[PDB]
Amino acid sequence: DPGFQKITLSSSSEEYQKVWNLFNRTLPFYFVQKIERVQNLALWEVYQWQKGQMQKQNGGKAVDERQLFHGTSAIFVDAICQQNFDWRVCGVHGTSYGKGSYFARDAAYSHHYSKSDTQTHTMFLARVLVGEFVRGNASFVRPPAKEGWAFYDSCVNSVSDPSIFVIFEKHQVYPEYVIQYTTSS
Ligand SMILES: Nc1cccc(C(=O)O)c1
Known part of the structure; x- marks a missing residue:
């Protein structure tokens, strides 16, 4: 009916x-x-279709696919579950690696973006097709062209040890799991 469930x-x-286990890795x-x-x-279906497309243009490489975290306020949870993450809701400004949606390797980094008035914070685990990445920049509205040739699939804070995508x-x-946690008890 709403086109989604939360189980x-x-x-x-x-x-x-x-x-x-993945959350606890850095918020134990x-x-x-x-x-x-x-x-x-x-x-x-659309995510699986995109992964399929990326596999076809990949030169035989596996598509880099990661389970990454996204801290958000509880108010946005059902919107995300229905329409996916959308960076234009509030917009992006300040320290950008680009105008897109942000995901963290470590739950611990996403904590700061899980706003609450309460003791209960909310964070997503997402399935992300990061593919081939290059370092981001504030002015990017898309990933830049590769050198020569084709485009990168995503941007990061660090090619050698990426922790922000x-x-x-x-x-x-694909928004995979809603994680509700407390900092107290
Ligand atoms: N890594 C990163 C950067 C900015 C926001 C977030 C988030 O969890 O919303 C994550």
Whole structure:
């Protein structure tokens, strides 16, 4: 009906533990209170179609695909689950690696973007087709051309050790899990 569901997971399920393990990797002192699997077939189908397209233009390489974090306010959760992340809601300004949506390797970095008035913070785990990346820059509205030739698929803070990714194309992201956690108890 709304085109999506959010399915609360059991903490005894291995699916839960996989998500929790990744969060806990860098926020081990916080307390996960719920994890919901985002179920949106249309966003999944388009993402899988994009991955397929990237595989065809890749020169036989695997498409670089990562589970990355995105901190947001609870107010945006259902919007993201239905329409995907959209960087133009509030816009981008300040320290840019480009005008696109941002994702972090470490949960710990996304904490700062999980605004709350309350003790309960909310963060997404997303499936991101990062592909081939180059360092970002504030003026970028797309990834730049590769040298010669073709374009990069994403931008990062560091080619040698990337921890922040910017995506300019929503078909390269699938919102996977909503993680609710507390900093207290
Ligand atoms: N890495 C990175 C940079 C900026 C915002 C975020 C986020 O979690 O929203 C992540």
